[PDB]
């Protein structure tokens, strides 16, 4: 009777996307937990690198929170049984509050980390005298607090409704927007604009300035050989490639997600055909895959290039096994 509300897709694609999500879950939780332990172990001369290690700890914690808070619930009742919504009444809006607070936390952590890398490389002498560990802890708790308070419109706009043809039905219960279409359009536009356009602009501008400056330092070191010469230019080239990798991974991971939310909020009910319905749900699986890639690709960037960070990490895995 509620068969029109059902989403009908090929079940083997559901099995594939479930296996990909389990793989991303185990890799991301392992990477971010052992990243937090490795950043906890570092204890020798904390003056100004403790700032960046607190930023890396905040970013790994936010990715771990995206994975742990999001993956089981969205996996279960957005991939397998979206129809009954077995979780319940206030859990709908609480769950969107948690997911969107975690999304803002990861966005502002990558943005703040780019800000701190800019302060450390391009204006290096002022970063010691100006910024402090108290200043860094203030700034990190401030961006976590701002990520908490931005997600409150997603707490108001989301809620349970009963979209069955009948008034009461067990499978009728769904977890949708409840407020008027113009209002939820404003909320999704502000969410998309802030959580994508503001980090993408600051990441693009700052990481491009940093990569330009340390490519100038590459040209300087190759111009004028020394004892650490073939180590320094390799360090700087891998720094350039980390900066471009963070920018490109940010775009490729979080553009299709906001494209999905925006093409939800724009397209009116007259334009939806069942082709767009089915394309939306396959697009939903694809975009949440590209979304959960970003929670995993942060410890991979650190173990790739930092040789100090690599050894403590692989010894920590050797201690566990």
């Amino acid at each position: 009777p509620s068969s029109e509300l059902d989403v009908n897709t090929d079940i083997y694609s559901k099995v594939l996307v479930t296996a990909v999500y389990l793989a991303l879950f185990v890799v991301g939780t392992v990477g971010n937990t052992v990243t937090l332990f490795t950043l906890a172990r570092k204890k020798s001369l904390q003056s100004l690198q403790s700032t960046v290690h607190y930023h890396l700890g905040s970013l790994a914690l936010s990715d771990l929170l995206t994975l742990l808070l999001a993956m089981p619930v969205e996996l279960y009742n957005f991939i397998w049984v979206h129809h009954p919504w077995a979780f319940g009444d206030a859990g709908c809006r609480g769950y969107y509050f948690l997911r969107d607070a975690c999304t803002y936390a990861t966005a502002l952590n990558v943005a703040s980390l780019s800000v701190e890398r800019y302060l450390a490389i391009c204006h290096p002498f002022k970063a010691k005298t100006l910024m402090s560990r108290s200043r860094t802890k203030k700034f990190i708790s401030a961006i976590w607090l701002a990520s908490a308070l931005l997600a409150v419109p997603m707490l108001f706009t989301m809620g349970e409704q009963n979209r069955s043809a009948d008034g009461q039905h067990a499978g009728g219960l769904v977890c949708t927007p409840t407020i008027h279409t113009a209002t939820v359009k404003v909320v999704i536009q502000v969410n998309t604009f802030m959580s994508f356009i503001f980090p993408m602009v600051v990441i693009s501008v700052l990481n491009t300035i940093i990569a330009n400056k340390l490519t100038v330092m590459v040209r300087q070191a190759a111009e004028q050989c020394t004892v650490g010469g073939p180590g320094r230019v390799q360090a700087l080239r891998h720094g350039v490639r980390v900066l471009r990798a963070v920018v490109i991974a940010f775009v490729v991971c979080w553009l299709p997600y906001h494209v999905r939310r925006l093409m939800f909020c724009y397209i009116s009910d007259e334009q939806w055909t069942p082709f767009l319905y089915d394309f939306y749900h396959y697009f939903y699986m694809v975009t949440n895959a590209l979304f959960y890639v970003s929670s995993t690709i942060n410890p991979i960037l650190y173990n790739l290039v930092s040789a100090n960070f690599r050894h403590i990490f692989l010894a920590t895995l050797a201690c566990l096994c």
């Binding site: 509300l5 989403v7 979209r163 949708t176 999905r260 939310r261 397209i267 939306y280 749900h281 939903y284």
Partner: peptide, 6 residues
Amino acid sequence: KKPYIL
């Protein structure tokens, strides 16, 4: 037929 999952 608007999809409802966001």
